[PDB]
Amino acid sequence: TGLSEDEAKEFHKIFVQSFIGFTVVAIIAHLLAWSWRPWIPGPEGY
Amino acid sequence: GLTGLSEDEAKEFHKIFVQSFIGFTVVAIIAHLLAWSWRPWIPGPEGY
Amino acid sequence: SEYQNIFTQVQVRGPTYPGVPLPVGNEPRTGKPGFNYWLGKIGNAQLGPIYLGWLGVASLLCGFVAIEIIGLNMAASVNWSPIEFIRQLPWLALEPPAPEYGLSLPPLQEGGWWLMAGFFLTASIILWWVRSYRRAVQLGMGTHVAWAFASAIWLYLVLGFIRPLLMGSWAEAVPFGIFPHLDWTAAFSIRYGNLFYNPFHMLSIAFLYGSTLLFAMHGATILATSRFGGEREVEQIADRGTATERAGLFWRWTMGFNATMESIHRWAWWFAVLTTLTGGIGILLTGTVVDNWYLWGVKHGVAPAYPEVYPPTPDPAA
Amino acid sequence: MWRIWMLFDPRRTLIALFTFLFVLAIFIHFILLSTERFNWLEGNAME
Amino acid sequence: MWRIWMLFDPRRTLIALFTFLFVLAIFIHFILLSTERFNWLEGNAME
Amino acid sequence: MWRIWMLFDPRRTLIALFTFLFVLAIFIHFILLSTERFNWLEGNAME
Amino acid sequence: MWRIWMLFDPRRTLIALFTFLFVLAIFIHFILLSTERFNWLEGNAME
Amino acid sequence: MWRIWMLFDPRRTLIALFTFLFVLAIFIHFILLSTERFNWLEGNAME
Amino acid sequence: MWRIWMLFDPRRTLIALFTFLFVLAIFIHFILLSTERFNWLEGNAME
Amino acid sequence: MWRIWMLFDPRRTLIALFTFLFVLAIFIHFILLSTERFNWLEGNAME
Amino acid sequence: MWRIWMLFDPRRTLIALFTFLFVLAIFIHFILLSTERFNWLEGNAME
Amino acid sequence: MWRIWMLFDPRRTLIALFTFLFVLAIFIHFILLSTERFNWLEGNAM
Amino acid sequence: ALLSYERKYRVRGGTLIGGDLFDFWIGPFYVGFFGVTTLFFSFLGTALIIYGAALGPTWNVWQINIAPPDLKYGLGLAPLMDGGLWQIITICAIGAFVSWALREVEICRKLGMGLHVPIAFGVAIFAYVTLVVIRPLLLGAWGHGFPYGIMSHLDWVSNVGYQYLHFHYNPAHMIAVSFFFATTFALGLHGSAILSVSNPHKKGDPIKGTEHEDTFFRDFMGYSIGPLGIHRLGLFLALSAGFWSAVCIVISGPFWVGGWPEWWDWWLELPIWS
Amino acid sequence: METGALTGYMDVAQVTLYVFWLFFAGLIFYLRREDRREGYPLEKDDGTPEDIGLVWFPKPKEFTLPHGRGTATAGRKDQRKEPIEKVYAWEGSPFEATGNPLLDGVGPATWAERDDHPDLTLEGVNKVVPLRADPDYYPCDGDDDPRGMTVYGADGKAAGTVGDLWIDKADLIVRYLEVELADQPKKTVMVPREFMRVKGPNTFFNKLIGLPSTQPGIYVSALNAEDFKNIPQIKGNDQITALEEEKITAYFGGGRLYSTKEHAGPAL
Numbered sequence A: 001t002g003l004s005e006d007e008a009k010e011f012h013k014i015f016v017q018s019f020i021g022f023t024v025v026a027i028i029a030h031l032l033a034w035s036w037r038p039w040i041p042g043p044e045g046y
Numbered sequence B: 001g002l003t004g005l006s007e008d009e010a011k012e013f014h015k016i017f018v019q020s021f022i023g024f025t026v027v028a029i030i031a032h033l034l035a036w037s038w039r040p041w042i043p044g045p046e047g048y
Numbered sequence C: 001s002e003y004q005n006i007f008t009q010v011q012v013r014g015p016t017y018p019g020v021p022l023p024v025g026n027e028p029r030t031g032k033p034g035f036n037y038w039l040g041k042i043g044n045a046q047l048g049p050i051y052l053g054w055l056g057v058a059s060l061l062c063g064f065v066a067i068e069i070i071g072l073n074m075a076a077s078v079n080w081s082p083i084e085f086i087r088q089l090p091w092l093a094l095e096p097p098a099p100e101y102g103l104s105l106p107p108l109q110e111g112g113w114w115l116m117a118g119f120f121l122t123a124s125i126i127l128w129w130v131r132s133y134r135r136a137v138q139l140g141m142g143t144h145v146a147w148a149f150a151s152a153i154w155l156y157l158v159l160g161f162i163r164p165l166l167m168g169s170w171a172e173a174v175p176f177g178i179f180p181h182l183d184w185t186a187a188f189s190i191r192y193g194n195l196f197y198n199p200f201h202m203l204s205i206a207f208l209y210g211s212t213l214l215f216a217m218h219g220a221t222i223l224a225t226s227r228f229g230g231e232r233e234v235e236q237i238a239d240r241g242t243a244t245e246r247a248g249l250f251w252r253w254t255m256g257f258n259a260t261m262e263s264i265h266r267w268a269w270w271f272a273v274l275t276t277l278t279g280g281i282g283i284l285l286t287g288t289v290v291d292n293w294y295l296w297g298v299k300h301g302v303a304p305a306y307p308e309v310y311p312p313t314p315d316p317a318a
Numbered sequence D, E, F, G, H, I, J, K: 001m002w003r004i005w006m007l008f009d010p011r012r013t014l015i016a017l018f019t020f021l022f023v024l025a026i027f028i029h030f031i032l033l034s035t036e037r038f039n040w041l042e043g044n045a046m047e
Numbered sequence L: 001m002w003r004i005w006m007l008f009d010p011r012r013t014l015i016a017l018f019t020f021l022f023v024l025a026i027f028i029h030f031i032l033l034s035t036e037r038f039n040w041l042e043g044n045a046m
Numbered sequence M: 001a002l003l004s005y006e007r008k009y010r011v012r013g014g015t016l017i018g019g020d021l022f023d024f025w026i027g028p029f030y031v032g033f034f035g036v037t038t039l040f041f042s043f044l045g046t047a048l049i050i051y052g053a054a055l056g057p058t059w060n061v062w063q064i065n066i067a068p069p070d071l072k073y074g075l076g077l078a079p080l081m082d083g084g085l086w087q088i089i090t091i092c093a094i095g096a097f098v099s100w101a102l103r104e105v106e107i108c109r110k111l112g113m114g115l116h117v118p119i120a121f122g123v124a125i126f127a128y129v130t131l132v133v134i135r136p137l138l139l140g141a142w143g144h145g146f147p148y149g150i151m152s153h154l155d156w157v158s159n160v161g162y163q164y165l166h167f168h169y170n171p172a173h174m175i176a177v178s179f180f181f182a183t184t185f186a187l188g189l190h191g192s193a194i195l196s197v198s199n200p201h202k203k204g205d206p207i208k209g210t211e212h213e214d215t216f217f218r219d220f221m222g223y224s225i226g227p228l229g230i231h232r233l234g235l236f237l238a239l240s241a242g243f244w245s246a247v248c249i250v251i252s253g254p255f256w257v258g259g260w261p262e263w264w265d266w267w268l269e270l271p272i273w274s
Numbered sequence N: 001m002e003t004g005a006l007t008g009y010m011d012v013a014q015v016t017l018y019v020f021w022l023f024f025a026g027l028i029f030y031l032r033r034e035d036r037r038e039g040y041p042l043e044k045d046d047g048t049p050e051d052i053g054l055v056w057f058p059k060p061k062e063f064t065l066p067h068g069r070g071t072a073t074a075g076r077k078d079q080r081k082e083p084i085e086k087v088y089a090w091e092g093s094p095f096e097a098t099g100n101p102l103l104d105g106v107g108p109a110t111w112a113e114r115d116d117h118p119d120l121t122l123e124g125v126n127k128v129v130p131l132r133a134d135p136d137y138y139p140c141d142g143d144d145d146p147r148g149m150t151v152y153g154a155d156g157k158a159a160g161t162v163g164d165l166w167i168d169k170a171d172l173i174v175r176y177l178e179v180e181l182a183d184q185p186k187k188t189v190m191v192p193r194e195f196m197r198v199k200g201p202n203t204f205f206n207k208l209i210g211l212p213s214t215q216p217g218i219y220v221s222a223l224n225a226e227d228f229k230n231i232p233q234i235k236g237n238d239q240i241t242a243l244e245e246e247k248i249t250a251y252f253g254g255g256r257l258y259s260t261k262e263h264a265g266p267a268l
Ligand code: BCL
Pocket: C067, C070, C121, C125, C152, C153, C155, C156, C159, C176, C184, C185, C186, C187, C188, C189, C190, C194, C195, C196, C200, C201, C204, C205, C206, C208, C275, C276, C278, C279, C280, C282, C283, M157, M181, M184
């Protein structure tokens, strides 16, 4: 990999933040999509 | 000097290139005016 | 007129090559190698020796049983007439079991022989496959032949075993005959609505066309650069020569990109295996998960719609 | 967990991850477009 | 069980494991989609 | 924005730009010719 | 604008341009021949 | 007889034997499933 | 315009032109033959 | 104009010219053979 | 005629002759079996 | 005409000539068998 | 723009037409005179195909169909929207394919290579002109050519095949298919063979030479054709596949009109077993 | 749900097709990476390297050679100074030889820097040897023996006589013809098999029918008789080095453009 431990931690810090930011935007998108049309049918089937 | 032309050679080619492009375009413009006088190609609301 | 390297003009003769020494645990090679002049015109003149281990003899015996079952049944179908056997040979077949038996074991009268021939032929092919694996490993070479062979077996297995298993009927399988298995091939496409519209059949044909295209390119490319030693490909891979450079540059200047001497055989390997890999998947899909490929094409916007030269014909059966 | 980057190169992993994420997102969008309820372009009614 | 990594390279094991886990997950999601009961996009009624 | 030419070769960018723009332009003309309303050579009536 | 010839070689440029201009010219002549109104050889009536 | 193993290598014999036994076991299990009486998954009645 | 021979070598600019001119000439004769009015061999009434 | 034969190979120029002349001559004969008026073998009536 | 063995190899010419003679004999027996009159195994009536 | 064997190998000519003679002889016999008049095995009326 | 070994080979000469004027490169592509004509015919043919697609009912890639003219037009040029466009594209395709082959000849000459590749491509061109020129010419109408569409020409293949009630029984088709199957089988074997010696079973093992290549196939199938033979045989099988494909379709219609299984009655009616 | 259906419109066959499209795209990407193991990184016409990134250019492939020859690395950069000059200044222009391209190794005469050691059989002995160094090998009966025949140049002029045959031990085939030059300054010259045509009475259509050859000999259309003297000479005896093989075969490859000039200049 040719990476020291210091750069490995520093990349992982940004990677986790970017993943959280990407997930947070997606979570909001899924909340908006659910408010539009929920995708869990239920006993009656939509 | 990417193409190997000096500044003067680029001047000379461009002048002839522009002149012949203008001559080529002028003939085409006359051809299009004759074509328009024959049958215009813009339909109109009823589309001729 | 220059030499086109089509036929070897001057062959040389010497001691026959007995093969590289096999490691301990291998049978001695059988046969006394000899030289064939006409084979040496195109390639190597030496014929043999062959390796006949346990896998070789077991595969030969299993294949012999399958061929005998097929041949004796076709001979019996013409009342054991050798004259009618030769005359009708392309038309004769060992018929697959009747549809009434499903996946159950059928009697000899109604396709029991087909199941035995299919079983012993499959065992022969499988034993031949591991022999292909073993012969490569014992020489220290990679097992690329065995896995390319596995792709061919994959289509063979789905055609006669896996798809009939999924359809629950041995009658869905291929007869052991020359013309009848062409009839089965035609009937298969007809039954499932123009297998031309099977996208994996399209892929298999693209790779079959590509494989023939690639060998036309590669065979001609190597022959055109064999004057620089292009036929010694493995030597070119380890130590690149002008033959590899000219071969790559010809294709780079022609179509804008090229391969290496090693990577062209990776293209060759993958195009060949993908022919049977895609084909096996396509055959496995039809009847199990798609039953009318043309209607699948119209469903997915694949089938073109043609202008009506005649009015649409109503079906007279209501 | 930072030690994961001592195994895989972060830059090539990012390329593969971003390619994977876009392809997955495209296919999930297309899967929804293939349904009647979740096709926002065809706009079928619910229930 | 730490000894298992003395025979298997962590990099190739993780790549194979992640590829296997994702393919299995996609395979199981698609299998559910082919069922009437568990197709959450088509939303068939229970029972 | 003069800094983009520190990154991109002006000659290769111009070649890529010109061919891309013509291909886009000719395909937009093609798309217009495929419509009833905007095919100027067919001259279909409006509405 | 003469500086375009410090980036584009006149020889290759003119060969590409004249080839392109010819292809486009006979392509447009072909398009008109394919139409009812502008097929000057078939001579369909106007309107 | 212990002398059986002077002839045949123990390692090759075991590899072939294990494959042969499993293939035979699969062969017999499939044959039983092909029958009405011995298909334990279908569970047909007797007689 | 005599300077074009500095750019384009005339020894083979002619062969690239003669085979161009004949193919264009052979083709225009073809288009005329395909027409009802200008096919001088079939010779339809001019109207 | 005799100088051009220093720049053109007299042998393969003559070969190509004869091949072109014969192909054109054959082609024109065939086009006449396909016409109702100039088919001298079918021999249809004039007018 | 004894001189033909100066040119023809006696061993190779005998093998070819015997192969030719047997093949010819088989086909003549074949042709007779194909006919109605000379099929001595089917034994069709004369006239 | 004895000089024709100066040009052609007598052995190879004889093999080719005998092969040609037999092939033609077989070919003509088969053609007669195909005709209704000259098929001596079926034996049609004249 | 250049491979690390490319610079020495980028020399002048080897052209058939144009000589010095077109002897240059654009990126990796060599142009030559026939490259210009290839571009001319390719752009013209592609533009006319896209124009026919635009004027067609749909933009669906699978459903775009540039059909040939009706059979009633015979060998003449039909109106552009009634199959004439297909006729022009066919000429452009032939011009592009021949120019591509002649361009490959110039590149072959420039590198000192043999002309095997353009000749092998000529077999492919021969199959196309058999489908699009020779067979329509022998049948007397350009409408017998296959349409230019991804799915429409597959429908053409199906309908031509069933014009003889069983195209599998076509004797030349039987030969051509076997060659197509043989070259793919040979290609898989040849690609596997070269990869096996250059990629040994144990990683970081000595590379294997031609002796191992010969020994494996002698061990496996009892015969090894050698590195030179496999490329000769592989090219032969591929070209035989292309050649017999042209034969199989050119005899269907021009030289055989009934069901292809009928044709085998010559074998069944041989006087040896009639 | 229908048996093949997934989402009303989606079905199993469709998603199976898209699974293959993903695999095929990955395979094409993988195959293109293997294509870049040689000839990369790209360089400009003046030698300046081009930028390749990392997802396309793979790590160097190391082949361990047999016979204790060490390890070989794919993508070897040749170190000989190129005796060429760009004809024009713009990129994509041809290169002109600043000397004699036939002897300088330029264009069709270009030779790569192959190994300076002879190719060896698996046993460990030289693969390519003259017939004088191994009487166990001989020309096959039924094929004309080149030894003794005179070698003619492309112009039809005699260039020498065959003195020996160099054969490959692994593949029983003639690899080179040792030609004793008719013109002498005993200078011998190597003619590769693929660059020569044998015209004896045992080739074909001559053994089958029995016709003698009118003018039997070895015919080389690649080079004129005068250019035979400049064919690169092998350093040693009874042993030919792979680099020497490359130079001899490259010299013949450039003959059609530089020696006979039949490929030099347009046809028409
Ligand atoms: C009317 C007929 C249908 C049609 C019906 C089918 C059917 C059915 C199938 C194909 C299949 C294929 N079709 Mg199709 N096909 C049609 C039209 C075409 C056209 C064309 C231009 O018209 C072409 C080029 C093709 C080409 C193809 C191939 C791409 C593919 C076969 C791959 C292969 O090589 O496996 C050939 C090799 C094998 C099958 C076996 C591989 C090796 C085995 C192990 C051999 C063992 C040898 C054995 C030991 C020897 C001893 C045996 C004993 C003597 C008995 N088809 C039309 C639409 N086609 C096959 C496929 O997979 O497509 C999806 C298939 O099943």
